[PDB]
Amino acid sequence: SQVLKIRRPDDWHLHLRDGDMLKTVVPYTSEIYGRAIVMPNLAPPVTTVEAAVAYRQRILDAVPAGHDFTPLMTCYLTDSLDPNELERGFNEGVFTAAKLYPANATTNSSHGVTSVDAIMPVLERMEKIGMPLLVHGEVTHADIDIFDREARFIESVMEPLRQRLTALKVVFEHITTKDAADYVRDGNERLAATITPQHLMFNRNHMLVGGVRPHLYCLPILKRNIHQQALRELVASGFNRVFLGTDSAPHARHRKESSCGCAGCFNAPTALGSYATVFEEMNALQHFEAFCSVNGPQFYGLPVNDTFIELVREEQQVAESIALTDDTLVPFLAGETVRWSVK
Amino acid sequence: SQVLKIRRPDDWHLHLRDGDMLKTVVPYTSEIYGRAIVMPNLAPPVTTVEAAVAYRQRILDAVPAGHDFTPLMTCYLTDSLDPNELERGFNEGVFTAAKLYPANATTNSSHGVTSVDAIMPVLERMEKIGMPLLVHGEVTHADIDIFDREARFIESVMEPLRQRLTALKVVFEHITTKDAADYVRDGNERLAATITPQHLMFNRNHMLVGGVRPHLYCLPILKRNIHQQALRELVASGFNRVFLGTDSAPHARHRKESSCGCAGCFNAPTALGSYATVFEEMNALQHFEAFCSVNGPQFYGLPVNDTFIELVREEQQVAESIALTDDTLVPFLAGETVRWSVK
Ligand SMILES: NC(=O)N[C@@H](CC(=O)O)C(=O)O
Ligand SMILES: O=C1C[C@@H](C(=O)O)NC(=O)N1
Ligand SMILES: [Zn+2]
Ligand SMILES: [Zn+2]
Ligand SMILES: [Zn+2]
Ligand SMILES: [Zn+2]
């Protein structure tokens, strides 16, 4: 019965993959979101303007006619990346931002960054030109417990980095901890964050109690409930430098359900409604539109979308699976109900 | 090529399942172990003398000709269990011990326990007749973080129980925490524990870093490294009330590698060599025999085995999988090179 009309949202953290997977997954984004930050961790990674242009066009090809969707491309930072390549791409309107993957921290990160020190010239060029840095903020040393890797990044990498480049704009991507939430809440106007639906809706119990649920396995790893509650309070507070970033990260069913399941939730179909439910539960729906449709554009210095969509509080059952060329794709919340759906 | 000769070991915590799965897995135990504690969590659970007698016969039917193997049966404790049935089974030599699984108010009275308080008559009967209680020591409350559930059990259930029943012999099964290692270390002669190979060899990073690994998913859940080290230190100390209990807990591959993977490591084929590897690494091979072959018997008041077994330090490959009637079974350490194997 109840209806929320919002300014059309954007997705400030998205994985679209490539080839046939891309053809399948883009419509779920393009039918709802005006723009999306398309992450660059392909194999091989997007590290040049040329690759970004070609990838952008492959994305455009797969967008149904009538969807007004623009992909905002990113550069995959590497230790040896030429600052001139980054800047050329930024100047041509190709790269909207650059993404920092610590080497081996996540999906397709074996070519990632080894030290902040090795990429200083690139980061100084980004600071100079006003290009935002998107950060997957986890340390990677093998002996550091997986649940501590986010918190340990803040003090060992993030804070030193930001002290060294005081004008650098940084998005702490997909935060999962009270540690990061506090850090961001207490930061300056040059620091922001994105938060996924899964890190708002669930904690590690939901992935591990009663059975192991690979479709909830994603990075940074789901944390203890105290952390989940901290993220929920952050978004519900109206804090205006947190915004929607799904981290929709699809893998074929049998790459999830295997002896070594890949990290990532395919939440593009259900993210917006799921976010609606969280804001509602936190009695903070007055802050919902800003999170979805205003805070991101503001941080990125981009206009807000000029169209509007409607969410209705009618219960929508989520598909058990989505067809791929080979295998199927299991949506986040598969077989489940979502409280809010798009009109 | 180094040889390690020990009195024939026993397995003080084993799942043998039933039907065709039982037929497949029993040989991996019976070729090596003289005796094993056979847990009672069948569907439906073993809660009567008659069920236990029938199950023992089915186990015996599946032992290859020549293997000298004796299953030691257990009763699953339930709200509805008649303490007379339990005592009769104990007196008739059918029940070696009784197993207490975590309480839950919603459990059916024929399939489990709603609270420890609810089954005092039966526990008093065990204390009376000198029947050992085997405890899966976790609390199940949805509000408790999965990694905290063992520690919470010690505080809220184990200690008050052992306070109310001072003559009760208790095995803290498959301990996974420093909390439990300390508790057991500091307890009296009526308190012992078993430790699995996976909880000595790995911690939660091995299950979750670089992919989700359902064949390392088991209960109690793998803990952070500080807990692993406490367990390794405990067995290496020579403390004589910890002993071998594999918790070998087989599930078909498709039940492990699913959207909701079952908890349990099938480690019967590789457990003994794995324990040898751990004791060697801890420079504690002088305590290895006692762990495998002496401590359990002493605690249960049974004789030590009179035959011997040899492990040789020659590298060997663990099978990738083991055929079942339908599907396959993936062993603990599948496809890996292993350091110690049985001659
Ligand atoms: N989050 C994930 O678990 N997976 C993402 C990578 C990322 O955002 O780190 C992916 O691309 O698969
Ligand atoms: O407590 C248990 C039960 C066992 C089983 O599968 O029977 N599996 C486990 O991992 N832990
Ligand atoms: Zn990431
Ligand atoms: Zn991502
Ligand atoms: Zn158990
Ligand atoms: Zn068990």
CA dist B45 and A177 (Å) reads 41
Instruction: Give the number of the ligand closest to the Cα of residue B249.
Output: 2
User: DSSP for A275-332?
Assistant: HHHHHHHTT-GGGHHHHHHTHHHHHHT-PPPS-EEEEE---EEPPS-EE-SSSEEPPT
Helix (H, G, I), strand (E, B) or coil at A138: coil
Q: Which residues line ligand 2 (CB under 6 A)?
A: B 15, 41, 136, 218-219, 249, 263-264
> Do the bridges between strand B191-195 and strand B242-244 make them parallel or antiparallel, or are there none, so unpaired?
parallel
Radius of gyration, alpha carbons of chain B: 19
Resolution expressed in Å: 1.9
Residue with tokens 């209990």: B245
Instruction: Give the number of the ligand closest to the Cα of residue B264.
Output: 2
Question: Given CB atoms, is A217 within the 8 Å cutoff of chain B?
Answer: yes
CB contacts under 8 A, B 78-107 vs A, are none
- Kindly state the tokens that stand for A93: 């309107």
CA distances for B204 relative to B143, B208, B209, B219, B333, angstroms: 21, 6, 8, 12, 16
Residue with tokens 């009296």: B188
Residue A313 CA from chain centroid, whole number: 25
Q: Which residues pair with A118 in a beta bridge?
A: none
- Residues in chain A closer than 8 A to B259 (CB atoms): 213-215, 257, 330, 334
For residue B264, give the ligand 2 atom closest to its CA: 10
- Kindly state the tokens that stand for A151: 């918190």
DSSP secondary-structure letter at B158?
I
- Kindly state the tokens that stand for A323: 């067809």
User: DSSP for B278-328?
Assistant: HHHHTT-GGGHHHHHHTHHHHHHT-PPPSSEEEEE---EEPPS-EE-SSSE
- Residues in chain B closer than 8 A to A205 (CB atoms): 142, 145-146
Full 3-state SS string of A145-178: CHHHHHHHHHHHHHHHHHHHCCCCCEEECCCCCH
**Distance in Å from the first CA to the final CA of chain B:** 12
B100: nearest Cα among B52, B147, B169, B155: B169
Domain ranges of chain A: 1-343
> Do the bridges between strand B11-14 and strand B35-38 make them parallel or antiparallel, or are there none, so unpaired?
parallel
DSSP secondary-structure letter at B89?
H
- Residues in chain A closer than 8 A to B217 (CB atoms): 208, 212
Helix axes A178-185, A225-236, angle to 10 degrees: 30
Q: Could you tell me the distance, in angstroms and rounded to a whole number, from the CA of residue B220 to the centre of ligand 6? A: 9
User: DSSP for B197-228?
Assistant: HHHHH--HHHHHTTSB-GGG--SSPP--HHHH
- Kindly state the tokens that stand for A228: 């989940």
Q: Could you tell me the distance, in angstroms and rounded to a whole number, from the CA of residue A31 to the centre of ligand 1? A: 22
For residue A136, give the ligand 1 atom closest to its CA: 9
- Residues in chain A closer than 8 A to B334 (CB atoms): 259
CA dist B126 and B166 (Å) reads 12
- Kindly state the tokens that stand for B17: 């399942």
Helix (H, G, I), strand (E, B) or coil at A192: strand
Residue in chain B lying closest to A213 (CA): B260
Looking from the CA of A253 toward its CB, the CA atoms found within 13 Å total 17
Question: Are B212 and A260 an interchain contact pair (Cβ–Cβ within 8 Å)?
Answer: yes
Handedness of CA B287, B291, B292, B294 (dihedral sign): positive
Question: Are B145 and A258 an interchain contact pair (Cβ–Cβ within 8 Å)?
Answer: no
Question: Are A213 and B262 an interchain contact pair (Cβ–Cβ within 8 Å)?
Answer: no
Residue B2 to chain A, least CA–CA distance (Å): 31
Residue with tokens 């941080």: A299
Q: Would you say B158 and B102 are in contact if contact means Cβ atoms under 8 Å apart?
A: no
Q: List the catalytic residues of B.
A: 247
CA distances for A302 relative to A297, A333, B106, angstroms: 5, 32, 53
Residue B245 to chain A, least CA–CA distance (Å): 22
Of A205, A211, A259, the CB nearest to B262: A211
Give the contacts of A333 (CB within 8 A, at least 6 positions apart): A267, A270, A274, A318
Method: X-ray
- Residue A123 is assigned to a ligand binding site: no
**Cis peptide leading into residue B220 (ω within 30°):** yes
Give the torsion through C-alpha atoms of B124, B125, B126, B130, to 10 deg.
110
> Do the bridges between strand A316-317 and strand B308-312 make them parallel or antiparallel, or are there none, so unpaired?
unpaired
User: DSSP for A227-246?
Assistant: HHHHHHHHHHTT-TTEEE--
Residue A250 to chain B, least CA–CA distance (Å): 14
Burial class (CB in 10 A: 0-12, 13-18, 19+), A231: buried
CA dist A281 and B295 (Å) reads 54
Question: Are B214 and A212 an interchain contact pair (Cβ–Cβ within 8 Å)?
Answer: yes
Residue in chain B lying closest to A334 (CA): B259
Atom 1, ligand 2: which residue's CA is nearest? Answer: B219
B201: nearest Cα among B228, B219, B176: B228
Residue A265 CA from chain centroid, whole number: 11
CA distances for B139 relative to B72, B149, B160, B264, angstroms: 27, 5, 14, 18
CA distances for A132 relative to A49, A69, A74, A239, B111, angstroms: 17, 21, 10, 19, 58
Of A146, A215, A261, the CB nearest to B204: A146
Residue with tokens 């099978």: B319
Q: Could you tell me the distance, in angstroms and rounded to a whole number, from the CA of residue B70 to the centre of ligand 2? A: 22
Q: Which residues pair with B194 in a beta bridge?
A: B243
> Do the bridges between strand A341-342 and strand B242-244 make them parallel or antiparallel, or are there none, so unpaired?
unpaired
Residue B218 to chain A, least CA–CA distance (Å): 9
Interface probe for A, chosen from B138, B150, B212 (most Cβ of A below 10 Å), is B212
CB-ligand 1 contact for A237 (6 Å cutoff): no
Q: Would you say A168 and A190 are in contact if contact means Cβ atoms under 8 Å apart?
A: yes
Residue with tokens 């083991």: B322
- Kindly state the tokens that stand for B178: 């420093």
Neighbours of B118 (CB within 10 A): 15
User: DSSP for B3-21?
Assistant: EEEEE---EEEE---SHHH
Question: Are B142 and A213 an interchain contact pair (Cβ–Cβ within 8 Å)?
Answer: no
CA dist B94 and B147 (Å) reads 35
DSSP secondary-structure letter at A262?
P
* Residue B134: its H or E element: strand B133-135
CA dist B47 and B86 (Å) reads 8
DSSP secondary-structure letter at B195?
E
B318: nearest Cα among B310, B307, B329: B329
Give the contacts of B6 (CB within 8 A, at least 6 positions apart): B288, B289, B292, B293, B308, B309, B310, B311
Q: Phi/psi of residue A306, each to 5°?
A: -105, 10
- Residues in chain B closer than 8 A to A112 (CB atoms): none
Q: Phi/psi of residue A319, each to 5°?
A: -55, 145
Give the contacts of B43 (CB within 8 A, at least 6 positions apart): none
| B75 residue type, one letter | C
| B59 residue type, one letter | I
Helix (H, G, I), strand (E, B) or coil at B51: helix
**Cis peptide leading into residue A250 (ω within 30°):** no
> Do the bridges between strand B3-7 and strand B242-244 make them parallel or antiparallel, or are there none, so unpaired?
unpaired
DSSP secondary-structure letter at B116?
G
CA distances for B169 relative to A129, A168, B197, angstroms: 72, 64, 24
CA dist A232 and A181 (Å) reads 10
Q: Phi/psi of residue B185, each to 5°?
A: -55, -40
User: DSSP for A70-134?
Assistant: EEEEEEE--TT--HHHHHHHHHTT-EEEEEE-BTTSSTT-TTSBS-TGGGHHHHHHHHHHTPPEE
* Residue A37: its H or E element: strand A35-38
Q: Which fold has domain B1-343?
A: TIM Barrel (3.20.20)
Give the torsion through C-alpha atoms of A185, A187, A188, A194, to 10 deg.
-60
User: DSSP for A201-215?
Assistant: H--HHHHHTTSB-GG
CB-ligand 1 contact for A176 (6 Å cutoff): no
Neighbours of ion ligand 5 (CB under 5 A): B 136
- Residues in chain B closer than 8 A to A260 (CB atoms): 210-213
Interface probe for B, chosen from A146, A202, A206, A212 (most Cβ of B below 10 Å), is A212
User: DSSP for B60-84?
Assistant: HHHSPTT---EEEEEEEP-TT--HH
Question: Given CB atoms, is A301 within the 8 Å cutoff of chain B?
Answer: no
Residue A56 to chain B, least CA–CA distance (Å): 29
Q: Could you tell me the distance, in angstroms and rounded to a whole number, from the CA of residue B15 to the centre of ligand 6? A: 6
CA dist A259 and B119 (Å) reads 40
| B157 residue type, one letter | V
Q: Could you tell me the distance, in angstroms and rounded to a whole number, from the CA of residue B198 to the centre of ligand 6? A: 13
Helix (H, G, I), strand (E, B) or coil at B123: helix
Helix (H, G, I), strand (E, B) or coil at A38: strand
Give the torsion through C-alpha atoms of A275, A276, A280, A285, to 10 deg.
110
CB-ligand 1 contact for A199 (6 Å cutoff): no
Residue with tokens 């350490």: B333
Question: Given CB atoms, is B261 within the 8 Å cutoff of chain A?
Answer: yes
CA dist A176 and A245 (Å) reads 13
Q: Phi/psi of residue B245, each to 5°?
A: -150, 110
CA dist B11 and B29 (Å) reads 8
Neighbours of B237 (CB within 10 A): 14
Q: Please calculate the CA angle B301-B6-B238 and round it to the nearest 5 degrees.
A: 65
- Kindly state the tokens that stand for B283: 């420079």
